[PDB]
Structures are given as structure tokens and as C-alpha cells.
Amino acid sequence: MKIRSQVGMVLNLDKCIGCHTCSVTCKNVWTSREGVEYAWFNNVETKPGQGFPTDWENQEKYKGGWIRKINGKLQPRMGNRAMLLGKIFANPHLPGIDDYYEPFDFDYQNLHTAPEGSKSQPIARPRSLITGERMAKIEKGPNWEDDLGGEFDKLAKDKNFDNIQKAMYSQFENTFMMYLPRLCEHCLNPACVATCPSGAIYKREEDGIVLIDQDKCRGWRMCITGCPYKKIYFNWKSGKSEKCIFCYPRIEAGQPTVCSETCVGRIRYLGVLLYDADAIERAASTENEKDLYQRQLDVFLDPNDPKVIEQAIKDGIPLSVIEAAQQSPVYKMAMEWKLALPLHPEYRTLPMVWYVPPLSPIQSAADAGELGSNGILPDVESLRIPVQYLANLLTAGDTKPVLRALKRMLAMRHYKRAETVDGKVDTRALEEVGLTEAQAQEMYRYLAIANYEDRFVVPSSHRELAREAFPEKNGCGFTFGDGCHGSDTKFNLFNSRRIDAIDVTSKTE
Amino acid sequence: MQFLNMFFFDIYPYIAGAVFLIGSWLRYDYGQYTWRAASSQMLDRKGMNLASNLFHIGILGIFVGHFFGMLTEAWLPIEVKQKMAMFAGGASGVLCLIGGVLLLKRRLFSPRVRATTTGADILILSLLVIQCALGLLTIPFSAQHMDGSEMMKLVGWAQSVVTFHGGASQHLDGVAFIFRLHLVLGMTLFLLFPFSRLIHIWSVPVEYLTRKYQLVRARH
Amino acid sequence: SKFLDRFRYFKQKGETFADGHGQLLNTNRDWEDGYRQRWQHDKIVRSTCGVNCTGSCSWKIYVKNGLVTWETQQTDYPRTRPDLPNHEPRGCPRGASYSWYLYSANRLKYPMMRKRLMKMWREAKALHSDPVEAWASIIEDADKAKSFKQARGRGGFVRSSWQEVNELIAASNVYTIKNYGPDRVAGFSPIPAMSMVSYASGARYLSLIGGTCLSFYDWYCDLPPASPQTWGEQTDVPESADWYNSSYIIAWGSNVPQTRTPDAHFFTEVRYKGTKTVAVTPDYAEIAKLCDLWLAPKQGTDAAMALAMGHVMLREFHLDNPSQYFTDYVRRYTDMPMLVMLEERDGYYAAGRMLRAADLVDALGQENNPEWKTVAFNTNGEMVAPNGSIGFRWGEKGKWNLEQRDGKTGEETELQLSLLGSQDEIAEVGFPYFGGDGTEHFNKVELENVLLHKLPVKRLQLADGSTALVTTVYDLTLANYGLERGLNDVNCATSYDDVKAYTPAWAEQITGVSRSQIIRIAREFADNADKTHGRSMIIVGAGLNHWYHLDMNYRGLINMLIFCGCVGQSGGGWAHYVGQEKLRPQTGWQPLAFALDWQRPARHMNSTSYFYNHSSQWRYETVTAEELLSPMADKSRYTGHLIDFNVRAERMGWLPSAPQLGTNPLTIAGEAEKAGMNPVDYTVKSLKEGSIRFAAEQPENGKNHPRNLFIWRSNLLGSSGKGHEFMLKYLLGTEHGIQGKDLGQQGGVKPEEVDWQDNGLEGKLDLVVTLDFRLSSTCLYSDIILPTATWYEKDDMNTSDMHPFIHPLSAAVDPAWEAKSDWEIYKAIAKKFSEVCVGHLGKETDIVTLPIQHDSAAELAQPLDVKDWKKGECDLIPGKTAPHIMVVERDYPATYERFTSIGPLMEKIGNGGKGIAWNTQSEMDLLRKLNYTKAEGPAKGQPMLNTAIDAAEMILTLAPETNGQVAVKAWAALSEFTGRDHTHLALNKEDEKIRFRDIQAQPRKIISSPTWSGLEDEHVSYNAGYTNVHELIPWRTLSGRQQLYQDHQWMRDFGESLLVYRPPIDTRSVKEVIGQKSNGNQEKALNFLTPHQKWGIHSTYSDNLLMLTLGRGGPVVWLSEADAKDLGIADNDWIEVFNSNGALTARAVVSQRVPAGMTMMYHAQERIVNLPGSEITQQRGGIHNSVTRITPKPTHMIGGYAHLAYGFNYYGTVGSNRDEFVVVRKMKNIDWLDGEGNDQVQES
Ligand code: HEM
Ligand code: SF4
Ligand code: SF4
Ligand code: SF4
């Protein structure tokens, strides 16, 4: 039993409007440099589709995530330590630049410098950001399939259509689409960390954020294959890998991530989750992949249990973190209401970014149909998005938790309508799904009203603990180049000292 | 000629050896962000599988042969080591050269690789291909002295160089010229090592084979 | 030492965890500073996007390293009630990518000029020391004028300087005003709400010099003529937060998540409150993803579904089981009980005009405007003139309200709705029906062009001894819908399955939507409305409003909402969202933008008629008026080209003109002086005699076309401008891609009001000046490009229809390179103009025509019919049967001084708008202290207007929405008309004064104002029409109520007195070009729809790399799989779309969500990026507007008639475009025409 904390994220797909604002803000701040211009830490994909990189969910092709051996032990699908090492001179599964898209720019200056007497209006043609050469045509992009852009038979190759008779969905009347915004999961059992030969990737203890140490990374580029979500991008210029950093510079002071605060649909929730690090391997190696979801929930700890609180303190969790964990929207959606589900729990990484499945218009039927258990509002069985699809995406194929989430959402709706339109108290739908009137009211407070202070309950990472904030406050930022940052030993070849440190020791003790 | 012989085989070896070591240390302490393998695989996967493997498995064979070859009686008289070096090392060398040549054809003519490469990457790779070609070329010259007479000379030199014993150059009295070129170009590579992509070699991830899978860094 | 640290290998290993699966390390993490220092910044500045999207989102502009690096939404908007979600963070993807423009490769850094033009300018200045005369030497030379006009859009821009361009512009403006007239100079800038002062800058300069200010709301087809028709209001809608108060919403032709992104959460969140949502779109649009039901009617057939839905509602909630709420609602708030006169036909009657107090002997005791007061029957069978009709608005006070009272005895009455049960006899009335016409692409249902229905009537004794039959609008309405009321009406329905004049079965055939669906939603919608007393809402957008018959689509939706009493109730009503037309502090901004502080009036113009005329799109018209008439109208009373109707509209004072007269309006006074007549009389005499004519009559004579055009905050040539190819040919005089022949070439019939000439006048514009921060398509075709400041480099304000906050645009850093804010650009031009004009223009007298204005007493022009003075049907009475003829003094040398100061008219005359006026002296005194005053010169003592901030403060201090003091005086002014106190609506905020610097700190909610019909309150959300329904303030319509019946002559004869289904029109633009220039690949005709894109706001951002990267890398067109496969087109293949109007090139997006028959090129992707040469024109491929053409509609030209009177952006012809059809085909040769030898060839 070792309690650790992390700020998790829950995205309500039901409210996602597929706008991409989240993707742009991240890009502007973190990946506008040459080398990662093609990298989208946060990217939104329209489903059905194959995503970015193309078909990243196909683990038989890409080899991402963990596999549970016959003896019960965990191993990266990539291969064990020696197998992985044997592939280092040339990663055989590595995605190529074309699997993402060839980053491009346009010759705008031609619109400006076109010489007088041209025989046709000047125009700006595309140029490769990798070669600098003229591109005859743009044939791909990071969001190429946006809004069902492409033939159904092409989009339907979607790994999530497995085990589903998909013919019926190529019919205009049965058309359906949803949005899947995604970033790094900052998993509890990250495959990237396990697949990096130099050990440059790590999970920060105080807040669970997983980073690639830009000093230590050696560019072995094996981690990219290891991540089953393909959220690690190789910086072709620097020769090192980079990935979503969960905006730690902001999280550290209690601020939401950029993609969270900038989410126009108000669908992202940030809240603390306390977990037993000692139960990670045990949960990730459960026999049936359909149990990984529940096994992870079991690894989460109840922030209001004085047994948990007392242990948290003993294990070093700051008081303000424990308090935040007690008002965590993420805990309420994942543990209480059971509305949030993990993304592809079968990869066995124990993802920390969960999702609330979306509702959808009712399927096409012979007639305008009739009232169901929820009146004019839809019954979970009439939803047009095939539940088996959502289950392949969030619950290893098990439709039970997906239906429970969707049904409860509809339940809240039925209840709220009785109240606001009829003026009566009708708990029939709630009782049907096991929700109390209070839980439904609290679900409504968080999902519908969703005040800013309710969506984001981020505690400080407490950068003052176990460190020396005073000298840091005084000297951080003066980047003259003292050459002493980055190491604990004071000796240095350039015979210099840290600008943000005190080298004149007190002699008064 | 005696002047050049002393410069190149008595002095130069220590200049390149000092630059190699201090240059590596200094770039490690002040250039971590620049310390990478500089993979280009993603920009063009074509042929990289065969090429890189050939080149690396090959050059690593040579390196093992050269190591235990010149830096290390009854069960291993010099003549037997020569034969091993000629067949085992010659085979590795052919694999290395082919890979090296393919990697170079790629770096120079693969538009994406060429556009994003640095001068050093072309230089260093070129010098290795040439060094590997020279290497294989010494084979027919060692084939004239199957008794290990030449090898005994080269090994005498190498050993007196690494134990800081003066006069190392003497050990080379009359060796085939070809060997002289190989020794000089090979040492040069050590001189250019700390300023090239070759620093990745220092980072061969051996600790991985015995490391726990999940890493967590405490507050620091 | 990082090297030595390694040796601490062992010492850095802490505890393992998870039974050896994990290792805790105590190693250095300093490297993490790398990302921390990227996030760190210098400061944050508040600003917003000055683009037309309705977003009005406040952003945090980050400055780092002294440069703008990125932005994130502000979240400090004043929070809404606790039972409503808040607005933060708002924003969208386009807004998030704006930072890109500041230093990007397409940034305009210096003023630019076409080389050829620069070379002639400098050589002319070497021979002419005076710039006016240097310009003349160029412009008067046919060969010189041509060498630079045909250089337009063909490269050759060279770096110039502000000094040079400012002089050339001023010279050209002076010369043009002096020789042809001020109204030969014009400016085009849209939506002032997105950047008030930025729009005001050019508009102010133009207004002072007499130039024409072109409209935008109608031009862009955002104007829903149906609104001015039903409510006499340009547009007023509930705020987005109000959606949360609705329990039943239908998103009809509105892609909420894509076109109203920052407000979408209100839609997705209200669903959790129990609200049911329904999406109505032909394609599986993004909006469908968020609803409970998806209905997909055939595009353009929506009115049909509306009528059918209205049918059920009336049948079930008005007739069979009368809803008490709905009944009282239509009784007190619609013109249903009003009396309509029947006209004798042959065997049947036709609905005529509405009965007026004046028609009855007693005139019902109405001595004031009796010919403008409607009449109804009270429940005791007596006749009555109820309060509220447009007759009580002017010439009297106290009765212009909706208190159910007798306009004579002042006593309460109870209007009766239907004469059924009180009729003197059943008369048969003929109702027009068009549901059987149309093209092959839409289903039709044959019946009769005229449907006779049995209507209960009463014969009455008129005041002239004649006798006539009347009936209620109500009865006429139930008949038009096909409701059987017991008269055994053959043309009425016996069941919803009866294929007839408006049934669910009938609609199923036309729309393809199951009748049972139409019936289920119709019931639910009405049931909900009845239960909640009007909390049913319909969100509608350009999906419906951009069709030729948008009025039918709209009245269909409007009638549904009225029948359910949803308009005027929080959570209910008509939610029209298009362009950002709601500039809230209206009366504070108008005097600034048009210089009403110095001179009155200005020269406003409705842009659709303006471009239809000057870009000569009329010379190619295919649609005739006769084919739009009611089958019951005298077709001979309506002969002529559609433009002929416009010209007549102009001379009758219904619509504005530009240019106005065929003679320089600055020379009219000097001629009235030699004639011994005052200016006004001399012009009327000349008009009659024909010595002076309306310019519209001879647009190609050489003196009636515009010559100087300013374009800013707009991308007219490219994006916006319908009929792109026609503009290039007639306005610019450059190569064009028009494919079809004009009337003269097809031997068509010449108009009867406008001169005709076989060779149209080309290159009318002498100088095109564009202000922008990026080199847009319009800049590319201009003569002079002026580098303007981005939204992150200037101060200004922004408001929107979506929320009640007013926030600013702020300069995060001074404009980069040589850029200047729009305000500073026009001030400098005004300054150079004042110098350059010395000796050419002094204190001149200008004769200005002003059409009859809505919300002015003159709106009561022609009460019973239409009389054209030129046809001698009446005398020429300016302000009644013709436009007003105004006298305006202009002090050209003092333009700059006037521009930079608030004129005396605000003190001498006051301020006002929307029919009311008030004293604003106190505000001017306040302004003298905030802006300081002129120390000397012409404006000595007046407040200053030096900076954009001074201008902004002017707007805030003057507007009632931002100054509680003015708000009370404004509500007081209105109270005089209604006789009801309304000051109570702002007394509690009388001390409120919104300041520019305060909104930079935090956005501020505005104050309830009589300029709008909704309230800014803490307990009830803003809901359009709320005041009318709850304060009993009448809608500015003939009847004062919501007008279901349009009784204007033209409306009746064009078959639109009542709504009726009208199939999409045939633009006949495809059959004359298809196959004419084969390339080997198949061609096919498809409906060309242009909804607004996801990767830009119109064309803005289209060139933005982030948007281009998240989209498809450039211009693309969506096609259904079936249509693409039929044409041999694979996803992303180069295709060409074309018709008679021109051609465009782009790549294909093949998708299943697009229904066969339609194609979609999301609006505006313009002409500057990734476009290859066209195989149809051998020129650069065109844009989406290369295939469209302007086609006006007469019903939109009506003026001088109550709610149907003019107003800038209030009414006028609209640029509809969804009816268009095009030919699509896969391209063969892909030639870039750039000499790069990098062309391609597509197979098969
Ligand atoms: C400074 C470093 C180096 C030294 C001192 C060195 C020395 C030698 C010597 C003495 C021989 C002939 C062995 C005999 O006497 O039988 C040889 C052969 C050879 N070397 Fe090197 N060498 C060096 C670096 C390299 C490198 C970097 C490469 C790869 C490009 C290389 C590739 C070869 C090959 C292919 C052969 C011939 C076959 C064999 O003996 O394995 N050498 N080298
Ligand atoms: S989602 Fe993030 S933490 Fe999880 S395996 Fe991938 S990169 Fe690592
Ligand atoms: S910003 Fe929010 S609503 Fe928009 S795409 Fe991203 S996650 Fe979805
Ligand atoms: S473009 Fe409009 S909707 Fe988008 S962020 Fe800017 S103001 Fe908001």
C-alpha cells in the first residue's frame, strides 16, 4: 500500500462539438517548432475513422501496449527487454512520417512578389516543411477524415468496427459520427516508460504526470512503438521524442491544462485521484481484459475514508491535495456515477484520461415511433450509435458499463424534465438505473451547469516541498548560462556556480 | 617520412585520444540536448531495416574483433587470431560496408533524409565507409604474412600507445603502407567522435536488460 | 557535473513498488525548466476577434519576448444566474489560430501600389505639381487608365509609402467628387458590431465628403425579409443563454456546433435539463450529432414541412381542443382578428388589402391617420379600431400600445377571431398555390394554381356608398392551411393523409419526411409550448435563409411559433443566428460612423441593388418577374426587367440610389440660383421635366457609375461578392471567366426603365483601395493595399446577438512594421484630403436624396395602393411618393477637423433612433471632459476624436445601452408614444456608465434599451419581443401586432400576402454550358450549396496555416459517394465546378453524409491558396462565387409602407444563393500557369 496522487481528466464526449480549439491552443504553445510541427499532442478524430497516426488502434500492426503472458507476467507487446534491444538499429514497427502526414506550408510571398505582367493571377502553392520542395498536391493531414471525410469502406476499416456487422451503417439513413478528442493518458502502467532503453521516461511522484527527459532521452525511438495510443512523437530535428506534458508548468500552481481551460464545449473535468501504486502490476495483469476497467477502479482510493486520508499523509500527499481529492469531479464521474470509462483498457496501461460516452439521435425506424420509459426523450435502446462500437473503444468489448453510463444520462434527463416542465417529482427512471435524487441533482450540477470551479479542481504540485523555493524564487529565470543546472554534484569543469543557489554557507549553523 | 611517422604514430594518437575523452565529457556535461542517435528512420523507412542492421551488426563484429584482437598464448597464438580476424572480421566488414554504402546512398539521395541532414552526418558516415573499405583492403596484405607477422606489429603499436610507452611507432617498422592509412583514418575518427553523432555509442543501453519496468521520480 | 552524477547510480535508487514492477528514483529533474520557460510570458492583454462570426469572445493575448506568441480565452465574464451555465470560456478554433497572422509570411507590412500605376503617377506628378491634375492626366487617358486596370490581379505590386498613397488617394477622391459627384466615391465595410470604431473610421470620412456607404446585412443575405415583414424589426433574437430556458428546441438549418461554437454548450447542456432537441438538416450535419432526432427533408423544401406542422397545430391546439394560452396569445398579439377586404374576381374573390378605419363612414371616430389604422370586430359584433396600429404612432400620442382597447372610446374591448358563426354568407376565395411548379430535382404535388376555399364573410357599407365583403386574417389563415371548418370545402383536408393544401401527407411528398414524423414533432412542440406557456424555440440559420424564397421558409417557422405563443417568452420564439449584426450601443455609434454629429443625412445604399446594377449582373438575368407573379394578378401591370422594378422603387422613395442623380449633386444649387428657385424646388421641377434624371436610368452613360472604392474589414472580390466573374469584368476591367451570353447576345428583351447598349461598360472603378493585415484575394486585385493593424494591435469595441457583454479589442503591442489601425488610416487620409482639396472644393452645397425611412413619420406614405409619379399616377411629393430631397452643406477643407471632433448637431438637434429622440447635452458636457476639446480652428470647443479610444468613449457615453442616464431619457421618449411608463426598465441602473478602461478590466453587461425588445435583467434572460408582449409596446408594423397578412399591393400580386410553399427557383445557368467544352470526363448537374466552413470565418483564416492543416489543405468541395463514383471521382481528386457565371477548381471530399443531388463548398475558401488553372477558362481556377449571380426579388424592394419602409440594413434586396446549380466533373490537366513546369495530369 503506497498512496500516490495525480490529476486525472474526464472528457464528456456527449458535449464534444468536434471544434478542435483544444488542438490549436496546444499547438501554438507547445509544438510550433520545426521538428514537431506535425505533432499534435492534443488531436481530435472523427469516428468512424482510422485516426492519427493512421490506424493507431491496430496493435497487431503497431505493436503497442502490454500483453499478459501465459505465466501471468506482463510484457510489452513490442517484446521483452532483449527482443526490444534486438530491434534498436531499426525499429521494425515505427510509424513513418507518411502515417501522420507530410507537414506543409504555402508560398504566400508569391502573392506579394509576383512580377508585373504575369499571364495568370498569382497563387500560393504548397511546399514541404520536411524537404522545402514544391508539393504537387496535398494528399493527407492530421484531421483528414474530419466529419466523415472519405468513403465509408475506407473509414469503416476503423479497428473499433471489429465483431460488428457494419454493412447497415453505409446507408444514408443510419449515418452516425462522433468526436474523439485525445491526448496522452499519463497511465499508471505506462508502456512508453517500460519500452525506453535509456530510462529517460518517468512518472512524476507528486502528480502522476509522465515526461520524457529531454536531457536523458537518447533518441532510441522505441517508446513510440510502445505507446499503444501513439501519443509520443519523434522530433525529427532534435532526434529526441516529445509528448503531451499535461501542462505541468500550470498544473504545478493549481491551473487547469491549456486544452482543459480552452475547451469551448466545457467537456473536460480535472480532478485528483488517489491510487495504490502497489496494486498497479496486479491490476494490469488480470486475466480477462474485460476486468481491467473494474480492476483499475479498485486501485483508486476513497478520499473521504479516514483510513485513506491517514495513509495518504503518511505517504507524503500534501493536505491541499487530499482536500481536492475529496471534491474531485473525476472521482464522482468514474467511481460514483459510473459515467466515465477508460480509453482502451485492454492495452493494460491503466489510462488516467477517461471518457463519458455520447448520446446520439434515435435510429431510423418504420414510424415516428412512440413513448418509451422516458417519454418523448430517448430510451438507451433507440440510440443510433452502435453500443458495441463504444464498448470496443472504452470497455474491451463489454457493453454493460457503456449502457449503464448512457442509460443513467438519459435517466437524469427524464427526471429533470419532469421537474422543469411538468413540475412533478418523477424518480421512475432514476430508480431504474439505481440513482438517487441527490446523485442526479449533483450529476446535473457538474454536467449541465458546470461552473468553472466545478470542472477544474486542481491542487498545487507544491514545488516548495523537499526542495528550496526561496533561492529559486530569487534567481530562477536569469538564464546567463552558469552551466551548473541539471546536476546534484557541485563540481563542474567551467569552474562556475548556480545563479539560483546560495554558495556562501552559514557558519552560525 | 620519419618525421611524419613519429607525428602520426607517436603524437597524433594522444592528441586524438585526449580530444576524444575531454570532448566527450564536456559535451556530456554541457550538451545533453545534443546527445542523441539522430534517427532519420521515420522520414523514410525504405531500406533502413536491411541497411542499418547490416551496418550495425557488421561494425559491431569488427569492433569486438579489434578490441579483443589488439588490446588483449597457447590456445590463441597470434596466427590463429589473424585467421579469425580475416574470416570473421572480413565477413563482418563486408556486411558493414554494404550497409554503410546503402545508408550513404540514402542520406545523399533520399530527398527527406538529405534535406534534414547535417554536414557531420555525411562526413562521419563517409569516413566510416572508407575506413571499412580500407579495412577489407588490408586482408590481401595480411594474406601475404599468414604467420601473423604484420598483426604482431600493429598489435605491438596499439599496446604501447594505450600503456603510454614511447616509441610505439617502432613496432610498425615496414608494415604494409595500407595499414598506416587505416590506423590514421581510424584515429581521426576518434578525434571527430565527440563532435559527431557517434556519441550515441557511449549510450549503449545495457542497464535496460536488468531494469525494473516502471520508473517514478520523487520530488527533487 | 552530469557525468559525475551517473556514479551516484546506486545512491539514487529509492524504494521499489508493485512487487518489483516499479522503481522510485531520487534523481535530478532540473531539465523540466525547459518547458516551464516556454509557458512563461511578459504579460497578458485582453482583446477579441474583429471578424464576422457572432462569437464576440474575449481572449488573453500573450506577449513573450516582446512579441505576441499565443492566446487563451478569458473566463472572467460576469457570471449568469445560478440556474444557468456561464459563458466561459467561449472561443473557437479560428480565434485560437489568429496569433499566426502577426508575423506570418502573408502579413502586409507596407503600403503597396501596382507598379504600372506607380510609374504613371510619378511621371504625372513631374508634369503636374498639383496632385488632382496629375491624376486627371492619367485617368482621362484611355490608354493609361487601361494599362493599370488590366494589371489588376496580375502581380506587379511594389513597396510605396504612406505619404505617396495618401496623396494619390486624396487626389483621386477630390477629382472624382469635383467632376462627377461625391456619391461616385464609395466604401464597403461589413458588420460594425465586430469592431465599431474600425468600421466607423472609413464610414465617417465617406459620410463627411458625401460618399456612399454600402450596406451588408442584406447583401450577405443575413437579413430575413420575413422579420421586417412580421415585426417591422431588422433582427432581434434571444441570447444563447435563453436557450437554457427552453424545454423544446428545433435546430432548423443551423449548424450550431460549427457556426455558433462558443454558444453550443448552452444547447448540449440544456439537454440535461430535460429539453428535447431536434435537428433538421438534409445532410448528417454536426448539429445532428447533438440532437435526439434527425429529420432530413430535401434541401430547399423546408417551407413545406413548416406548413404541414402548422396545419396539425391549428387543427389540434386551436380548433379541436382550443388552447387557452394560444387563443388569448394570437388574439392580443397577432393581426388575425384584423379585417381583410375581398376583391371581386370572376366566379370567386381574392384577398385584398386590410380594412382601414378610413373606409367606414364614421372613420370609426378616427380623424388622425385613419387610412393607416386597421379594424376588427369585438366579441359583441361591433367594429373597432384597436390601439397599436401604425396610425396611432405619429401625429398623436398615448394609443400606440397593445392594451386591448377601442381607439375611439379608449375603453377595453375583446377582439373576436373568426367570423364563422356570424357570417352573412360564405364567399369562395382563391388562394395561390405553387407547390406544383419547380425543376426536376424537387418533387412536386399537382393540384390547382388557384385553390378556392369557402370563407365566412360579412358585407359592409363603406364610406363612399360602395359595399364590400370582409373576413379575418384568421379565417384566411385557416383556409390557406387547408383546415376544414364545416363548410364542406373540397380543397380542405379530411385527414392528415389527405393529399392537400398543406397536409402531413402533402408535405411527405414534397420534402420526403415521413408524415408521422411531421405529426409527432408538431404535436410535441405545441404540447410543450402549451404546458410551459411558450417555451418552445426554433434556432434557424443560413441553411434556410439563403434560398430565394427565404421568406417562405421563415414565415413557416414564424407562424408555428406564433400559433404556440412562443415569441416574447423567455425560452421561446424565433432564434435567427447568422452574421454578427447586433451592435448593441446603436444610437451611440450611428452618429459617429456616419457623421450625424456634423451633417444629416448621410448617403446609405443597399448593396444588392448597387452591385446588381454596377457590376452589370442584370445584363445576364434569367429570372423574370412575370414568372413570380400570383396567378391572380394582372400580369400586364408588372412588365419589365427585374432591374426595372428596382429603378421604379428608387424614384418612388422606397429604396436608396447610388450614384443618385445623373448630374453632379454639388452643382444643382448653383443652377437653382440662376433659375430663381431654391435647391429643392428646382430639383423636383427638373425631375419632372427630365432635365435631371435618376442615375439608375443610365448606369453606363459614363457618369453614373462609381469610380473610387474603399474596401476594409472585408474581402469583397474573393469571399463575399456574389458573381465574382462579373465584378472582375465590369467593376475591375480584368480578365474574367464568365461563360454565358448577355441579353443582347441571346437577343433577349431590354428593360423598360434602363438604357441598353450591346457592349457593356467595363472597368468602371478608377481606384480600388483595400485595407487589410493579410494579402487577401481582394488586395490581390486592388490598386493600392494599405497595411492595417491586426486585432491584437489596436483599440476598439465588440458586441453580439449571442450575449449582453460589451468588451474591447486592445493593442498588445504597437502595429508591426508600417501598419496602422483603420482609425488612424482614415484620419491620415482625411488629413491629406483636407490639404489637397484646397482650391478644388470649398464650402459646397449638396443635394441629397434620402429614401422614405421606416421608424419616421414619413413611413405612412402610400396607404392603399402604389402610384408611380413618372407614370403621372400622382404628383412628385418628396418624402411620400418619392425620396426626400435634402440640402447638406459640406466644408471639404474642414473634413479632418470635423472627423477629429464630435460635431454640434448632437447639441443643437439631439440624438435618437427607432422613432424616438432625446436631449443629450449632459453627455456632450461629459465628453468634453473625457476627450478634451479643440483649442482652435473650425471645431473649436467641441469634444475631441483623436484616438480610437476617444471614439469608443463617444459611443459608450451616448448610447442608452451603455449609459443609464441616456437609457432613462430614451425609455421616457418612448413612453410618450405608448402612454405607458417604461422608464422603470432602467431606473435601477440610471447611475451606470460603462467606460472603455473598465471593460478592458472586465466585460460589462449592457443596459435594457428601447432600441431592442428584450431585457437585460437579473431574473429573466434576454428574449426578443419580450417588451412587446410584456410592456405592451407594439411591433412597428401596419397593425402594431405580428403581421401574418402582408397586404401591400406588390406582396399580394407576387402571391405572398400569406405564406405558401414556393419550390426552389431555376437559375437556368447549367443547360447552356454543359458539354460545350468537354475534357473527356463525365459531367453532371448538382445543387450547389455553400454553408459556412469549419476552417475559417468566411474567407478570414482560410489562408491561416493552422486552419489549412486541420482542414484539407485548401479549397475543397464535398460530394456524396454516389455522385462521386458516378463521375469517376475519388476522394481528393481535382475537380471543376462551373456554370454560366464562371468556374472554380478544388479537390473533392467524398462522403456518405452528403445526400445524392447536392454538393457543398463551405463558404469562403477564396482565390489565393492552392488553386490550379481552370480547364474551362484557361485562367486561374475561380472561387465559390464564380458560379453564383445576383438575382433580386421584388417583394424585397417594397418601401414607403409602414414596416415595409427603408432602413440601412433594415430592408432591401438580398443576395440569396442556395438555389444555384452547377456542373461537376473530374479534371484532366492540372496546369498551374506559373512557369514552374510542375504540372500534372489526372488519369481516365
Ligand atoms: C583507430 C581505430 C582502429 C584501429 C587501430 C584498427 C586497426 C586494424 C588492424 C591492425 C587491422 C588488420 C588486422 C591484422 O593485422 O590481421 C584492421 C582491419 C580491419 N578494420 Fe580496423 N582499425 C580501427 C578502426 C576500424 C573501424 C572504425 C572500422 C569500420 C569502418 C574498421 C574496419 C576494419 C576491417 C573491415 C578490417 C579487415 C578485417 C579484420 O581484420 O577484421 N577498423 N584494423
Ligand atoms: S498514453 Fe502517455 S503515458 Fe500512456 S503509454 Fe502513451 S505516452 Fe505513455
Ligand atoms: S475544445 Fe472541447 S468541445 Fe472542442 S473539440 Fe476539443 S474537447 Fe471537443
Ligand atoms: S472567431 Fe468569433 S467565435 Fe471564434 S473565438 Fe473569435 S470571436 Fe469567438
Ligand code: F3S
Ligand atoms: S525510447 Fe527513450 S531514448 Fe528517447 S526516443 Fe523514446 S524516450
Ligand SMILES: [Mo+6]
Ligand atoms: Mo452573414
